[PDB]
Symmetry: D2
């Protein structure tokens, strides 16, 4: 009944200014507008979205409308909404129900407001976290027959879709864009490579060069963190449980050992594992004075922060999201973002260009499911490679790249189409 609900609609001009700046760093989304604003391949679609209502997501929203869709939006987190961004979407005449600092009750309400449109119920789900997908299946299963497809971009959401399918709960075809090369590499590797040191610097202003930096995990996040630190002249040590990832680290010349050993040597500690119990009290007790300890991996479970609160003799807040503990041995630990994500707590998260790749993935998913009614049966499907390739291609102009086109003869010799896809499904890049 409310046409939108935002904090302050007067912030819309400030939102529009930020939008004007972000658009230039989001060419993937802007290419989609250039290519599809006349043909309007999403005409008919009624997309309910649930995703961090940021400046970046606003560019995504307005891309979808430009492609012909009706769109109604909520946030997937209670603090990630940027109110000026939300105001700008509201003022543009797009139903948005989101503000910074929602209650759990207000959060659910917001999502519920996106389900019904002027002409009828939603017919497409765009989700980050599975909350919109879970709400429809548990609370509003009447609407499932009318929904053509789900796009999902997070690890949690994809893991959740696989369980729903395993248990017979899932009733709508779903495209997983989380495991696209263009999504995964920007969200995990390039993103964290840019923002790790940004967070550490804003938090501490510390010299990186000449320090030992211990990075737990050498997956895509660890790889980027390690590369970043190394570029500044830090000596990086890696820890790993996977022998293949450990081997990769060794072949780049990184020392690889255990946290038990490395806790005695590190000036800076970065956890990127996705796993519990990486840095623990017995590690803290061995650390050099004023060791910087932060997490860029799993939400808040990698570092035993509760140990520091329970065993330290002093806790002094330095600035927002920077606390300095003194231990019984008389040495200090500088803990960043309360053991949560350093890139969100002490910096501005992912750069716009990163979000461009992730959201251009989701625009592709939406078109693919909506444009091909009967193509995808109920289940979780990977985004086809040709669309993953089209995401990358959409950014090349901005990257100052001239891509080569295969000649017909060359394509014949390779046994592939000159428009792609160019690699088999098992190709690792």
């Amino acid at each position: 009944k409310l046409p939108y609900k935002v904090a302050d609609i007067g912030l819309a001009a400030w939102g529009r200014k930020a939008l004007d700046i972000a658009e230039n760093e989001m060419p993937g989304l802007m290419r989609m507008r250039e290519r599809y604003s006349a043909s309007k391949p999403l005409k008919g679609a009624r997309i309910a979205g649930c995703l961090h209502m940021t400046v970046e997501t606003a560019v995504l929203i307005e891309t979808l409308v430009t492609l012909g869709a009706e769109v109604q939006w909520s946030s997937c987190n209670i603090f990630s909404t940027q109110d000026h961004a939300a105001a700008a979407i509201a003022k543009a005449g797009i139903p948005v129900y989101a503000w910074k600092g929602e209650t759990d009750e207000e959060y659910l309400w917001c999502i519920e407001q996106t389900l019904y449109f002027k002409d009828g119920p939603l017919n497409m789900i765009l989700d980050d976290g599975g909350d919109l997908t879970n709400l429809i299946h548990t609370k509003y299963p009447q609407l499932l027959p009318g929904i053509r497809g789900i796009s999902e971009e997070t690890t949690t959401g994809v893991h959740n879709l696989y369980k729903m399918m395993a248990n017979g709960i899932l009733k709508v075809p779903a495209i997983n864009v989380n495991d696209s090369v263009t999504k995964s590499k920007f969200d995990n590797l390039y993103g964290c490579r840019e923002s790790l040191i940004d967070g550490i610097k804003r938090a501490t202003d510390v010299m990186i060069a000449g320090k030992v930096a211990v990075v737990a995990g050498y997956g895509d996040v660890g790889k980027g963190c390690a590369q970043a630190l190394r570029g500044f002249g830090a000596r990086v040590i890696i820890t790993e449980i996977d022998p293949i990832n450990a081997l990769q680290a060794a072949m780049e010349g990184y020392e690889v050992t255990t946290m038990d050993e490395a806790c005695q040597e590190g000036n800076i500690f970065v956890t990127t594992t996705g796993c519990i119990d990486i840095i623990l009290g017995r590690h803290f007790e061995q650390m050099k004075d004023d060791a910087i300890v932060c997490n860029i991996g799993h939400f808040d479970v990698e570092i035993d922060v509760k140990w520091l609160n329970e065993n330290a003799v002093e806790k002094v807040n330095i600035k927002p999201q920077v606390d300095r503990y003194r231990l019984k041995n008389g040495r200090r630990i500088i803990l960043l973002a309360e053991g949560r994500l350093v890139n969100l707590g002490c910096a501005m998260g992912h750069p716009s260009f990163v979000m461009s790749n992730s959201f251009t993935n989701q625009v592709m998913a939406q078109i693919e499911l909506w444009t091909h009614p009967d193509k995808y049966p109920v289940g979780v499907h990977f985004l086809p490679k040709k669309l993953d390739e089209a995401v990358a291609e959409a950014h090349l102009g901005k990257l100052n790249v001239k891509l080569t086109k295969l000649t017909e003869k060359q394509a014949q010799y390779l046994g592939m189409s000159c428009d792609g896809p160019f690699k088999p499904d098992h190709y690792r890049y």
Copy 2:
């Protein structure tokens, strides 16, 4: 009937000396010898092997005999045999039929001498290229019922296996070792990173720093080549047809453009594409005087060497595998290895440690098929991830890497066994 056939068995003390050195660089294979010589898991096995008869292969061969197997061998290429390696294998009482400079008839003959042992015929195939596999199926199909498994490590061989399977010709279970992470990364990326510049240096002794180097392709070979050239202070320009691979290069700060533009800029040219018509007369006509041109990708189809032979006013052999042409415009081009593989023509191919990973994959496949017949249907199977991990784990000691073991608690949290596998099959590393 003849117990072996080599060029000169007087080279066995030389071969043995080279073997001893190689063993220390092949910890994967030596770790297999340590772990499995008491249990003799390949006891009973009569393995026919068709694989370049090198020092490295000779270590693989003696690893298979340490594991209990009887083995008989030939090279999979007419020039690839190292005679001293073959002589050392011969003196050790291993029947080996291989020498440098075989004829095509002699090549076939050599493979045919490996099919029948003392106690009877072969029961296992270890292959590189599919020749030994194609010989059995077309010319000795009576031996097929008694053969338990094939292991194949080459792209050529695996494509050939899939076609045999699609057309009902394949009669034996086959493990594909080519697409293992440990095999593919070493054979493609790290191997070429180690040896590209070795070849160029041996051929030319040229300064690399301060040159423009044009690398066609940014797959695993291109990535390795590009990284190597960049380490020496060359400015690397990349050409690509895949949007994803092109973007990957852009994100490491490489210029990405077309060969049409780059041919006027490059001092050095390296083709890594696996494709036809990469460097053409069109391009040669524009190159700087004394541009160095070489191929490390596909055998011989990437550079149009035929054009040079037909259109140049001079062709001068500088040294073996180094030809300097003078064109009608008066400018000179230095072609390496006749447009064939520079790392083989102008250097010593892959370092032993690279082959340790590829051949340790092989031993895993041979154990896996001889030990568990029950397990694999007639068809082409990827090596299981746990064995791929084990290949990597076997090399970590040599690298002085201390791997972390997950606690029971951590493994339960991650929903994985603390012995692995640690990644899903779609994980790209």
Copy 3:
């Protein structure tokens, strides 16, 4: 008469907290405190200091008092004082006259309050810019006979000292600390390497990877800037007027060309030249939409900001020290810090460890002049190499570096003392 003058002495607990953190990053100064607090080598000294009243400078100040000196201080710039640092110095009973947002009259006043102590006038000068040195010589020349030495750390100040000496105006021996290896490398190369991208990120939050970055100049600041940008995966193009510096860039694989050509290519522009007319309207007219332009070299003379103010159709303040202009061609330029120093306008300047090297040079100079009057004629003297080495040696413990000591035999072979100096004065490192 007034015992100190600060903005708000209630900020002393905040200052003290910041000092404690900084001390651990300034091992050079803390090593001086450990080595010299028993012998009090600056006992008797009444040092007037004119140097940015920061947390780092506050550590220097308390180091000088630990060494026995009486000291009185003012900032060498009207905005550079950190009030909390000044308040902490004030509460500690050090007479300090400095605050953020002084007037020019107040600036002079503040320096004039440092000339006369309790027991009498100053006898030593520690200076940054030459202002305290110029004030004494023109306005208090009666105090010159009682002053034993000057230490000066700034290019501006040293040029000024040489002119004073050439024209017979200088009446006190002066050590030049600006051209020490430990000072110059940290203040110019490593400092700017640490903070360039900190400034750009804080200002813009922009992705660096995959951009063309144009760095004008390849001296020590350009080298550092270039290395940093390159580490993030930006493609760095360099402009130079010196053939040697240009060649150095070429040999690391940087493209070297003119601003006239590069202005059409760059996404980011960093001037490091110390020279006028580097970026002009001529260049702005050619730039890509939303090109980021910033200066980290000379104060404000490198970019023609005046042209932008006079010829743009829009100037919008995005945030403090970030202005986005729209030109008559419709394209936008993002100017950082009003063409002034990006690392100061948009970040926190040099990390503490950098200033530790510069200020540990200062302490060495002050000890050297107060302890050995006999030694230095009226004139400008480079810091002796052995003291430059000692500055570096003092920082090695923090870096967990184990230095090798020459044996007596090795030192005799090399014709040097095993305590140094280890290099001739022309050695460039």
Copy 4:
């Protein structure tokens, strides 16, 4: 009386071919020919040269003749002569007295043949090692008044000229080009960076990635070696006696410790110190099995090879300049080039482009002394910066560099000439 003496004058065509190839990698020398072949600034000069009679030095010789000088040449080492190069110079009508494998008696004779020309005695000395300079002063002091100048390019020769001057022996003005930036950087840093791994690879074919490489010394040679090894994925450890050099290493993220510690960890050992007793028996006894030990620094005094010969239980030659010792502990050491220079023993020395910078330095010295009769008094002088700059500038075209020219206004503001020099004499680059 003999017009030349070479090994075989029939090798001249092969020499000329190598010369044609080298000229394209020696633009500095070729630029000198382009600029000066008409004006002929060395007309009148009668230059006796003493320098490794290589293909590269042949380009230098023919550059000097092109500039108007009469030239007669000998080698400065008894094995460095490349006979085909010597043949080509002989056939061109230039008196050359040099062959590979001279006796000490033959060596002296060769130098003596260069002293007298058709029209009179030599009037200029071009020297590498000081042997020609020492011969004239001790044995032929009658000729000293007729000699306008000496150019010298080696550390030994420059150290020798300073002692001669200190003792009153030196009677001719001398230009030291050894300490030019362009000479020193190419001879010490860029040169060894290119050739170290070339030597190790040709000697061993070993994998570099994943190994610990211990580099003793972090001067210009160590810096280049370390950078090279790091680029291949080795983990580099540094040892150092100088705290400034140690600090530099630490700021690039290299572990810095002692050989006593590092001998237990290293897979590869490289000595670059210029000093005795770097690697010793007690280090060898701790080394991992098949550790590779080589020297690229001082001739043959850094490694205690005599210890290996006296204490090892086996010594096996692998190939030329590669010996593998077995110790009493049962482990093996692979020693390269008998502890002499690995880049000369196991590779082809410096690339041509390196020699171009060194020899273009000497052409500048010769012109400078000959063209300015009364400018330089007797003594050792550094080559002026403007000529060092001109050397760099001569190579920029080949490096694909477009150098910027200062505007008159810019030059005024900087207080320098728009033609240079651009830096003060103490500038370190």
